[PDB]
Amino acid sequence: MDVLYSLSKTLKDARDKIVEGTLYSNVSDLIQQFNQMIITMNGNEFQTGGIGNLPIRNWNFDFGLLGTTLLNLDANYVETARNTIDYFVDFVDNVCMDEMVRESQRNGIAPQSDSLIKLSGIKFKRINFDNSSEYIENWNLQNRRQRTGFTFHKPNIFPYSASFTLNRSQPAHDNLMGTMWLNAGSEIQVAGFDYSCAINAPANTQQFEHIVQLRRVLTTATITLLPDAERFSFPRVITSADGATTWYFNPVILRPNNVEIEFLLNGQIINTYQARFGTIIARNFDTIRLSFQLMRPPNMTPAVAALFPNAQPFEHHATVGLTLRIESAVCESVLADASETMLANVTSVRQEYAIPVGPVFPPGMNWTDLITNYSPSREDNLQRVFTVASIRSMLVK
Amino acid sequence: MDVLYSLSKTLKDARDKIVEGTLYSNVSDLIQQFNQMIITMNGNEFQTGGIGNLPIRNWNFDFGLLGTTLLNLDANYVETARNTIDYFVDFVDNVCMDEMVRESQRNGIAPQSDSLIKLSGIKFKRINFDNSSEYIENWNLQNRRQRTGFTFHKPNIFPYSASFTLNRSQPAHDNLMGTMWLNAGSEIQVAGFDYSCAINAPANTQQFEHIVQLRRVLTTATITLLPDAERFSFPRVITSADGATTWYFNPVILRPNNVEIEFLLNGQIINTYQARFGTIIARNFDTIRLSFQLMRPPNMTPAVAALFPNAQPFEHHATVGLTLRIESAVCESVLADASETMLANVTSVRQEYAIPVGPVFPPGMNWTDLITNYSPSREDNLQRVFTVASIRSMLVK
Amino acid sequence: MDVLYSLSKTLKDARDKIVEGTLYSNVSDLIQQFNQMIITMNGNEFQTGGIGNLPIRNWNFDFGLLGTTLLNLDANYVETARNTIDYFVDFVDNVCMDEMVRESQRNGIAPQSDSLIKLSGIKFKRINFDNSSEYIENWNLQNRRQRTGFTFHKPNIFPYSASFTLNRSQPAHDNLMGTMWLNAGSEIQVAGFDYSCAINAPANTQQFEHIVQLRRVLTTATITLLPDAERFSFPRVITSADGATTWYFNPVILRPNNVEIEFLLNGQIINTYQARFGTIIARNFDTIRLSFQLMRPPNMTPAVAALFPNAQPFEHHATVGLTLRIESAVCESVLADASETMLANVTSVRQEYAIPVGPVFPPGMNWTDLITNYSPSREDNLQRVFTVASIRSMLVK
Amino acid sequence: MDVLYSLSKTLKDARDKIVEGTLYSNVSDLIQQFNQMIITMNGNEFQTGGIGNLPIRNWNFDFGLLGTTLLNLDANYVETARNTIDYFVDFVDNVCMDEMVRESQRNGIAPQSDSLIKLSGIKFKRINFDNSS
Amino acid sequence: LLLKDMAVENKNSRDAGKVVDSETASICDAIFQDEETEGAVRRFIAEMRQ
Numbered sequence A, B, C: 001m002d003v004l005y006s007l008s009k010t011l012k013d014a015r016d017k018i019v020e021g022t023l024y025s026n027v028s029d030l031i032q033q034f035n036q037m038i039i040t041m042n043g044n045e046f047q048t049g050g051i052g053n054l055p056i057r058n059w060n061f062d063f064g065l066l067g068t069t070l071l072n073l074d075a076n077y078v079e080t081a082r083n084t085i086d087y088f089v090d091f092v093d094n095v096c097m098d099e100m101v102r103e104s105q106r107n108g109i110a111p112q113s114d115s116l117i118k119l120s121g122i123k124f125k126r127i128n129f130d131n132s133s134e135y136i137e138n139w140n141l142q143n144r145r146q147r148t149g150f151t152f153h154k155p156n157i158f159p160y161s162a163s164f165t166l167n168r169s170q171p172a173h174d175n176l177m178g179t180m181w182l183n184a185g186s187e188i189q190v191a192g193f194d195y196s197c198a199i200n201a202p203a204n205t206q207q208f209e210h211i212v213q214l215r216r217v218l219t220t221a222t223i224t225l226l227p228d229a230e231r232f233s234f235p236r237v238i239t240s241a242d243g244a245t246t247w248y249f250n251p252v253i254l255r256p257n258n259v260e261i262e263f264l265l266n267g268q269i270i271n272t273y274q275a276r277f278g279t280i281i282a283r284n285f286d287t288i289r290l291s292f293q294l295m296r297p298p299n300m301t302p303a304v305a306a307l308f309p310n311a312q313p314f315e316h317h318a319t320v321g322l323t324l325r326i327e328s329a330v331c332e333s334v335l336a337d338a339s340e341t342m343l344a345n346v347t348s349v350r351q352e353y354a355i356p357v358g359p360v361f362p363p364g365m366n367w368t369d370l371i372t373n374y375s376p377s378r379e380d381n382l383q384r385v386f387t388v389a390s391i392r393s394m395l396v397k
Numbered sequence D: 001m002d003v004l005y006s007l008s009k010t011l012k013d014a015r016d017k018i019v020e021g022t023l024y025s026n027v028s029d030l031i032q033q034f035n036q037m038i039i040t041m042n043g044n045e046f047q048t049g050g051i052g053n054l055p056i057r058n059w060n061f062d063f064g065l066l067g068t069t070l071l072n073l074d075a076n077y078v079e080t081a082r083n084t085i086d087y088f089v090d091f092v093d094n095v096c097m098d099e100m101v102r103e104s105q106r107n108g109i110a111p112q113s114d115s116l117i118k119l120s121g122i123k124f125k126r127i128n129f130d131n132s133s
Numbered sequence E: 001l002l003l004k005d006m007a008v009e010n011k012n013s014r015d016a017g018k019v020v021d022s023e024t025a026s027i028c029d030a031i032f033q034d035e036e037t038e039g040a041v042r043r044f045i046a047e048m049r050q
């Protein structure tokens, strides 16, 4: 595999450092590496494709090495080179794609394609070099067993979940108490509502709580926590839990009281914040617990008092909420986020070539389904497949 | 042009790899490249500025080479070097800026300034080197007429558009049906409203649709799709279509029914998603079509039933909506996005030097105006100008 | 200090370019640099830790070097090398962490730890090399007293602030006029409300204004400006200014009239935009001023007219708002943003090792507190500490 | 059959007793046995599968002996060895599985697969060893 | 360079052990006999064949 990597950085640092006008010596160390390749290759033949709509093209090698005309390259030098590169580019593309579609439950962490299986062969190792591309960097460190780690902006850790839980309800749905939320991507919005405005509640306070369990631990997370859940601050007509009817939600928002956010790891509180809105750091956690309360206002102007009567009908529904967004974080496992194109690359190549659903990944590489049941097999396959996508993007975007 | 590039990576990899200490051997390959430059330059004379409030400055060259002698580097070596670099820095800055202001209809792609036009000369080509900077990388591939491509976080593809369309209206605006939306940057929010809650509609369902045509194709897009349009979930007083009066919008939100998102390319459906909220991939499209419905709730608790009478006045306006955000995508054309400073750099240099409006770009480099009428000339000029901004940011931020 | 840097890029470019197979002549220039180090070190003793829950591990040096022969690398070569690297890694980690906790009122910009103070020594300078990591790049340019600069996506310039100002109020809070806002991170949302809908106001227009003073100047900012403040578009029960009671806010939204955004620098208007929504550029500013008005609709349909009576009670509260988001910008001072992990790294190391609160940073490295009173000492310490975090992340994530 | 057995204890006592570090003479008696194998093999082509969803895989043999030298086994020695073992492992697996599914009435105790039938051949017996399992 | 052109007999040991050059040779025969050299030494010297 690592083999593969090189092939590219070779070409990139090539299609880049090899231009009409640079002094030879700026590529002396490079040129070499290159040739070395051609050699090892020539002779051996390859097969790519042979699945879904993916074409089966046959590649063969027969190339002459590279000259060295002294003192900065002459145009002619380039063109005779570029012609050779273009065959490798169009090659790798086909190589990546071919191994970017196969999946395997048993050993879905190793090479699948006839193309790559042949590369892991020993007679090729002679190429590997400059492993600085963040992904390969972590691919190695994992083969030896050590502390990996990636960087993500607005990580996609929460499978889509939009629902509610009625802690107090009745057929008419005219005096409910519970929570409703939206967990998606890197964001959580949760609202706690009490139609009675805690009129009969101890200390006139209703407690709420929202717990979210991550499928993977996030470390070094920079998080924005804000009071209120705008998403649940407007009038709604919602389906009942049993789907038999619809209820009316007419919120009026109050500040969440006694806000406490806990970032836990294996049941232990690692970070805890009491009513701290703005930017907070959660250094290592697999669970987020948001606790907040609705406290009936002890003093009310007439306009406010009018919204909260001592007896039903309760027409204005007291609501308190929180919004939490993970701006950035590090994860030991690959994940989709708001900046990297890996998931999109893998998903796109599979869609374009009409690749049949396999035994590992959910239909369409669906993110929610994937992260919901993020098994070891799916993760190993995802990492292999993401690393290949990153190798491909060095040359083909 | 490519020439220009080098000049910088030369300086960067210079002001970076050259310091009090290190071994010669780590820069041997570098030092050379450098000198090579000085030579080609010396003797030549330049001129930058002259437009608007931009100062005119002349530059000459007559500099000594570099001691290729020493083993290690002594402080003294650096200082005698840094002094020479600083003249080039302050130079390039003035060079960039001077070519970052001029526009041109006929040939808005090639160089403009007396400064650069002279560089494209053959006698200077003896300086190109290490073109791994994403932008130049793509500048070349476009000259050779091949498949380019850039990477963007929250791209800026949608010109600002905030409006509505009343499909059913009357003077009193007391029983409207239509859609309202906000397309801006990488986001779309659209709501469909029916004051009558589909009371007289076939199957008690009102169909809605929102189509957005991109000015450029986006590929490998990672997109967040969520139900509801929070922006259109609150009470509003809006101006009538003819501007003669104002209407009242008092929404109550229901879940969008039969949601279907289609990402089309030249009229063909490339990706289609039915009621799938969360993260979805759109691999290649120039158009987005969002179709959704409002279905009158077949079963209603009293509180809900009360909002939707059989006869006017209709006081609670049934509304369904969708929110779509393009987190990342690739485009073959340069665009502004939420992370890159290119647009801001170009716009800022022009504003600071009071550069007069030209024949190509809209006043103030206005993004909405630019993307709305993204002509080939504007794109070629934008790419030239963005590539220069990126060359400049390697040294001056 | 710069010393430190090298130590890493040494190891990275090492644990990266040294793999079973690669051709020697790709590392010739590298190998050297490496050895050079071992030498300078051997014969030196260090000590890290001693504070809070940070272990006190001791280190010594005495190592053999590396062959220079071999066309290609044999597995055996690596392993005998990796064994030596791992001691340096586990070293640096402890070195970073030890200097990443101490703060000094006086010279919070200079080295602290017994470990590093010893490195700034002259006899170690013989190790410097390849300073291209954005942070060190800027560390130097500053030490020389020159123009710095960084890059941030969704910078964190606004300390959390969520409040209101009642310009017209009375005990019953039934006819208020004022503004409410949320400044946090890179975003500002502000709403102006007038319960009377400007019924007795000159020209039936109520003027609003919101001013935000940045603690540091931002340059080359790409900004999204949109009409409406969704956060303040829903019903709320709010505490009175004196905390003695609660008032009711029942907004109905109208388009903000005569919107004018000014980006000022030292009291001077640098950029001004009149009613321009979408993407705008603010090239250099330390203050943002948003002015907008509520204009009573001159023509109203019955439904609208009904919301705005000539006499109290005023039950629907006319509200106009704006939303402004700084997507990206450059700052001469380090700041937290939505992508970089620096703040989180520093905060996390301190939390994990139970580092006691010091004399410079607020408890918990609280961002709001830090940016609110961003003194020169806090900035120098923050930069030192952020630069170290970035050096560490090259090897340990 | 017994043949088969060896193939493994060979590999186990191999992937086990052969590691970065060990002194020479702890593999002398072993090393030998190993090589002896490679020889007998090289040249003969094999075939596994062909039934149900069992992939028809082709196997070939052409591996160099060993550097019966170095004192305290250098890392490099191992890796060049492990690479050869892994082909045999992935082999045997396929060999076992292929004969672990065929049934025969008349004479059901004997070997079935084209893979194994070929092993019971005399020219291979030169391998059997350590039947303590 | 080539080695056959430097071949030499490792006087001691089974397996017609041949070694690199003269010095290589000397040393072996030399140590072989310094009785205070771990049993592993003779062994290695021994069996190690070209």
Ligand SMILES: [Zn+2]
Binding pocket: A154, A338, C154, C338
């Ligand atoms: Zn963002």
